[PDB]
Amino acid sequence: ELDTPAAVSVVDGEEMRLATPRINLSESLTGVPGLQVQNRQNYAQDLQLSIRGFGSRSTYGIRGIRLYVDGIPATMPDGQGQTSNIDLSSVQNVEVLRGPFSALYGNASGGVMNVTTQTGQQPPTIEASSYYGSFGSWRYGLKATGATGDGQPGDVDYTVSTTRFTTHGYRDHSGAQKNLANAKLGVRIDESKLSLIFNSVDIKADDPGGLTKAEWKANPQQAPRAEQYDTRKTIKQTQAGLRYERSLSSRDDMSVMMYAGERETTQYQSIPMAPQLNPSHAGGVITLQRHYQGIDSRWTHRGELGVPVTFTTGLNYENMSENRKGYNNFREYGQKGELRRDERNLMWNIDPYLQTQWQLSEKLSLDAGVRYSSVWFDSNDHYVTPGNGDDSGDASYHKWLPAGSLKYAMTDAWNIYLAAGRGFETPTINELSYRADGQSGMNLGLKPSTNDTIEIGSKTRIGDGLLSLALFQTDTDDEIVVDSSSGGRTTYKNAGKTRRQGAELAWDQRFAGDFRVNASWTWLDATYRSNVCNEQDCNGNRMPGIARNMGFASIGYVPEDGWYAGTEARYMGDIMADDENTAKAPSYTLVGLFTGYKYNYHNLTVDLFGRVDNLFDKEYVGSVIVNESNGRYYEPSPGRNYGVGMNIAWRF
Ligand SMILES: CCCCCCCCO[C@@H]1O[C@H](CO)[C@@H](O)[C@H](O)[C@H]1O
Ligand SMILES: [Ca+2]
């Protein structure tokens, strides 16, 4: 796991946990270049997450990227993803792979992110963590982690974590309640190993919603429709995963990973009463009950014929079957009335793949991989009323995704690389559902997006840190956009190309006395090359969500036995919220400071810390609902907030 193969960046857990609420990924990995993450502070929705513009256009979920929590997929076959599962009080590391090689990781993999949980070791240590922040937020958690032996057959290892978090919300109708349970266990079968994962999330959050420009300027914490319709969500999910690994040959390894999980959600929307009267409308309440399961097999043969070549092959099967329903708001009233939608939508994914690393010469290697994505959608519709036809339908998609990188080592401390690949974006099941034709059935004409990505990078170990550089462009084509939309049913279309250019620069350094410095910047000019609007020429326009410029810089003094401190700074360029480029979110800069003491006397380790976020009380909006239907894009953010945390660790 070294910064050297490609444009890959790895963030450590104990540092992502250092004087932080341990709630949102945003607070931790906000500095990875090319990775745009913003915390909506709305636990009825997901983080605004994107990689080099991938998934930026997404409105309510995360799309166009790949996320794995302990090898369990967080993005579904169709590309839709979520973020509520991550327990930051028990994370080992987060690896982000951006660039063409992300295409190895599924259908809509413009960039793949992999979260893995702590392994546990000697001694059996128990931790009690607590944090309290402004606007009535507070979180606590217990983590027990240890091992039965050294690290041998029979040697077992355990890590359990539970956390509970509740907030009264900065803005009206935003209080949330979130409980996490995350466990990981391992047993050494022989010198062949095994592992189990158990994930559980339970959220009951009020969705504040968005605010229109006039509404945000007038009052920042206002949530007019929030209490009018009781906009809120409740999420519950449990995942079980199982992984086996065994070294067959002295030079050939192999592994298999399978997962089973169940998600269940309820969303009360702020949809008015008039539009729902049309018999074809789906309602104002969305109910979703999905089962997902999958199996992934990998064979890594370090056998070398032709040159020193190590290659990995494998097969992946992913399955998600959902029963989806909809309801009224009438009795808009806060509870749900007559049933107005019913379906079973299955989506499953099959595809082989393989990567190879050839050490053609010394200080020059060629990495190359391919994958054949095959995705199937079926919808069995159960709602056929006089006006709402039988919308059942079925479709499939296939594509060859290839990727490759040439790596040349100027030294062992400096390696440069050049990579390229093609990408793929299937239409979501929600996108095919309806057609502007008016005929009953799926819109079988819609085809997926094509990519065309090129990148160069230079990774240099200087001092005890690393300086990485990367430059990239992406050719999007057949972008899936909206065509018609009336009577509560949105229809989609293929129209237009796009081009997205950008650059990433990062530098990390550490010095004796643990003086640590970190910096990074990222440029992204993502423009359209074709009209993607029925009534307006949107050709030259920006891409909404992407920040033309962003940057991060932090400096920290971290002694191991006493007073520690640090301070961060984050710059976010002006980001457009429309395809037409009708609205913009301000360019804003935000500062943060923190101090604390780490008293570790023999077994007990008591860590105490305080935090000032948004030190200069800058007023801003840190999230936007891209392409909101009615123009309510803005999601304001609090000003100069604080937090304080206390952690206790006892070692056995
Ligand atoms: C290791 C197993 C890899 C191949 C797994 C293929 C299993 C997918 O099987 C599919 O299941 C769907 C419902 O679940 C059915 O609708 C399809 O008829 C069937 O092909
Ligand atoms: Ca129907």
Numbering used by the authors: 40 to 190, 192 to 231, 233 to 372, 379 to 699
Manuscript text:
The final TBDT possessed by E. coli K12 is YncD, and the substrate of this transporter remains unknown. The homolog of YncD in Salmonella enterica ssp. enterica serovar Typhi (Salmonella Typhi) has been shown to be important for virulence in a mouse model of infection.
To gain insight into the evolutionary relationship between YncD and other TBDTs and to provide clues to the nature of the YncD substrate, we solved the crystal structure of YncD by X-ray crystallography. The diffraction from YncD crystals exhibited significant anisotropy. However, this solution did not provide sufficient phasing power for model improvement. To obtain experimental phases, YncD crystals were soaked with potassium tetranitroplatinate and anomalous diffraction data were collected to 3.5 Å resolution. Phases were obtained for this data set using single-wavelength anomalous dispersion phasing in combination with molecular replacement using the FecA-derived model (MR-SAD). The DALI server was utilized to search the PDB for structural homologues of YncD, revealing that the closest structural homologue to YncD is FecA, which is consistent with our sequence analysis. Despite the low sequence identity of 21% between YncD and FecA, these proteins share a backbone-atom root-mean-square deviation (r.m.s.d.) of 2.2 Å. We determined the crystal structure of YncD, demonstrating that it possesses a compact positively charged extracellular substrate-binding site that is characteristic of TBDTs that import negatively charged small-molecule substrates.
